[model samples]
Each structure stands twice: as C-alpha cells, then as structure tokens.
Target: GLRHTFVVADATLPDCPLVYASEGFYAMTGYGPDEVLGHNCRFLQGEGTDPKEVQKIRDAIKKGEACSVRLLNYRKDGTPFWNLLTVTPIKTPDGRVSKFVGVQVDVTS
Candidate 1:
C-alpha cells in the first residue's frame, strides 16, 4: 500500500492554511476535505504535540525552506499517531514562493 499522505498549502496565506488535502492524507487522518479545508495543519496538533517540533516547522516555513519532522498528531477521533512530516516550498515561475507541499507518513504504522 502507498503510505504517503500529501497536502498543499498556500504560502501566500497567513499561517498557510491547507488549500488542498489529498486522498492519502484524508485516509491517514480520517478527515474529509470539508472538515480540513481552510485550516492550518496545526489543527492536527494536540496537548501532547511538542512545541519544539512545531517550532521547527514554523521556522522552516518562515524561511521558505524544506524540513522534515517527527511529531505527534491526532486523528479526527482524537487517536494519536506519530507523523513523519516533510514540507517544501513551492515557487512561482519568477521564484516567488507560491505554495507549500507536504508529505506525511504515519511512522506508528
């Protein structure tokens, strides 16, 4: 089985709320498109999710750099899973950052 989860976000948007959540991500998180659209990935984080892990992601996004992190994330029903997250900046033709592409895998599986 393909174990990759993918999401796309608008880098131009503040907090980079998700603009696209692929079927793989939906399957992994048990969240439907309507339930996640317009929300930042932070919504997946819960009290158990580490601030340091999240900070790394924020720093990477701020710098438009690619980053890989392992952190706790919750499913729609509140079950926890370890997410291996990879985020990369996508650029426009002129090199302006246009979006972010995310690849997530459930390492706990």
Candidate 2:
C-alpha cells in the first residue's frame, strides 16, 4: 500500500497544511502541500469518489473521532484509483482541535 498525507490551515509548520504526502501522493495527485493546503481535501476525490462515504468521514471528524474507509478517488491526471483514507483528530487540552491528520492509503492491489 502507498500513502499520502497532509494537514490543512497550518502553514507555520513544515508541511504546514499538507503533511505526510508520500511520493505516491505526489505521483498520483500531482499537487503537493503547496497545491493543497488552503483548499478543501475533497479535490482529491472525483467521479468515483463516493460522497456518501465522504460525508460519513466528515461527520466522524466533526465529532472529533477517527475515521477509516476505503473509497474511490482520482489522480491528478484524471485517472481513477482506490483510496483507503484514514483521519483522526488531535485535540488540545483546551478542547480545541489543533491538528487533523489524514492518511490516504492506496490499495489498488
């Protein structure tokens, strides 16, 4: 399995907004942290990207819970592929979410 990862709206840090984007992420998505951070993560999804599953994923995150599911996603070249996206919220002691880590695992096999 190949993986790509990133954080959003956090520019001060290295990855700032986009973190953990592996070679696969760049190879598949073409957009690196510089390309994705300020925008919504949904750009990675496409015709095959299941909105229902995405909604569920978002709902879980809204509740500050971890989410993991396998769904269809798209590549930068407009190619379709499988993505096993996993997301978890890292909360601060002040009860605010300081960071959200998301992992896109490619399990095309």
Candidate 3:
C-alpha cells in the first residue's frame, strides 16, 4: 500500500491551518478530512514531542525555508509514532509564500 502522506496548509490563513490532506494522511492518523481541516499540524504533537524539534519547525516557517525533522506524533487513537516531517513553502507567481506543503513519513522503529 502507498504510505506517503501529504498535506497543504494555507500560509495566509490564521495559524496556517491545513487546507488539503491526502488519503495516506487519513490512514496514517486515523483522521478524516472533516476532522483534520482548518487545524494546525501541531495537533499531532503530544506529550513526548520535543520542544527543540518544534522550535526547528517554527524557525523554518519563519524563514520561509524548507525543513525536515523527526518528531513524536500521536494518531487519532492516541498511539505514538515517529514522523519524519518535511515542510516546504509554496511561492506564488508574485514571489510570495502562499502555502506550505508538508510530507509525512511514519518512521517508527
């Protein structure tokens, strides 16, 4: 089965809430589109999530740069997994960042 997950967030929107999510993302997180939409990706973070890793993502977003980080994320069932997350900014024709594309890979081992 295809395991790759992708999500797109509207950077211009408040809190950069997710606007699009792939089918693989629903399978991985056990969340449906209705439940995942309009929410920040930080919802996936849980007790074991590292502050430093979270900061890395923040820094990257602030700088409008791409970043890859491994962090602890919880599924809808509250199961923890290691997620290899990569976030890249999407620029429009006017050279403004309009969205962010996030790719998620479950690397729990």
Candidate 4:
C-alpha cells in the first residue's frame, strides 16, 4: 500500500493543532489515535530534525501557503526516518482559510 497521512488543522485556533489524523498517520508515526489527536505534528520532530526545515513549514503555515519538504522525523519509538511532507491550505466557502491538509510519505532508504 502507498502509505500517506492527512491532518486537519484548525485555522481559527492559535497554533492550529491537528484536529484529525488519518489512520495512515498513526501507522507511520507509531502513535495511537488518542496520542496524536489534538497535537501538532511537530511532536514527531526531534533534535535530529533540521530546525531550518521546520522553520520553512512554519512560515508556510503562517502564510497559508503550500510547501513541500523532505526532512527528518521520528516515530514514537524514537527511530529517525526521512519524511516527504506537503502542506496545503484549505479555505472555507467564504475564502477564509479554515484548515490545513498535510500529506506525508516515508522516504527513508
């Protein structure tokens, strides 16, 4: 199966934590549904992850723009892996951004 993840972020909320995560996400991060729900995906990042790459993701989110990055991420077990991540902003019918949709793929070799 082609593994992927989807996250629904709340634009109305400060910090815009994820409100929903796909089952694929739980599998990828080794996180249970209860553990990841209502949390920011950054929790998957650790010291091995590049701060500059993380900054890029943050800037894109803040501007409601789309961005893709290949970065280091960790599973719940603390094993490092490569992640190909894309973030897209979704707007409400009123043209206001209501959420962000993220897709992630493991690119570790």
Pick the lDDT winner. 3
Summarize candidate 2's per-residue lDDT along 1-109 as a digit string, tens digits: 2346444334234232554455556666777667765666677777777778988876876676778988897777778778888877777788776666777767787
Ranking of all predicted structures according to lDDT, beginning with the best and ending with the worst: 3, 1, 4, 2
**lDDT score at residue 50, model 4, on the 0-100 scale:** 87
Residue-level lDDT of model 3, residues 9-74, one tens digit each, is 999985789999998899999889888999999989999999999999999987889999999999
Better of 2 and 4 by TM-score: 4
Candidate 1 versus the native: TM-score?
Answer: 0.93
Q: What pairs collide in candidate 1?
A: none
> How far out, in Å, is residue 65 in model 3?
0.6
Off by over 4 Å in 1: none
How many pairs of residues in model 3 come into backbone collision? 0
- Model 1 poorest 10 in a row by lDDT: 1-10
Give the runs in model 3 whose Cα sits over 4 Å from its true position: none
Would you list the C-alpha lDDT of every candidate in the order shown? 0.91, 0.67, 0.92, 0.87
Please give the lDDT score for candidate 2. 0.67
- C-alpha RMSD of candidate 1: 1.2
**Per-candidate TM-score against the hidden true structure:** 0.93, 0.76, 0.94, 0.92
By TM-score, the better pick of 1 and 2 is 1
Model 4: per-residue Cα lDDT over 3-109, one tens digit each? 77788878778787889988888888899978887787889999889889999999998898999998899999999999999999999888888898888988885
Q: What's the true lDDT of residue 11 in model 2?
A: 26
Q: After superposition, how far is residue 68 of candidate 1 from its true place, in Å?
A: 0.4
